[PDB]
């Protein structure tokens, strides 16, 4: 129906993502359908989804930095396996998730 109270989706991108270890190899992020605001962000077309950088630190002294989009129904798998070159992943933590809006780049050159 209708509604008197219309409010903008003031929601952080990291608020509608949740880690599942059954997601791929190490894990990934799936949509939080319990949040109404974040669902409207992508429903109206304010963004395409949640762009989050995940840094998977390994025993080899190196880390895998990945960037994907979590969207309603779409799953973003964190790049990495439980062991890379036999060296296990010890920690996982990257950068701030932000709302990714697409752009229409008209090329001039």
Curated annotation (Swiss-Prot):
GO terms for cellular component: periplasmic space. Induction: Transcriptionally induced by CfaD and Rns. Keywords: Periplasm, Signal. It is found in: Periplasm. Transmembrane segments: none annotated. It comes from the Bacteria. Disulfide bonds: none annotated. This is Protein CexE. It comes from Escherichia coli. The chain holds residues 20 to 120 of 120 of the full protein.
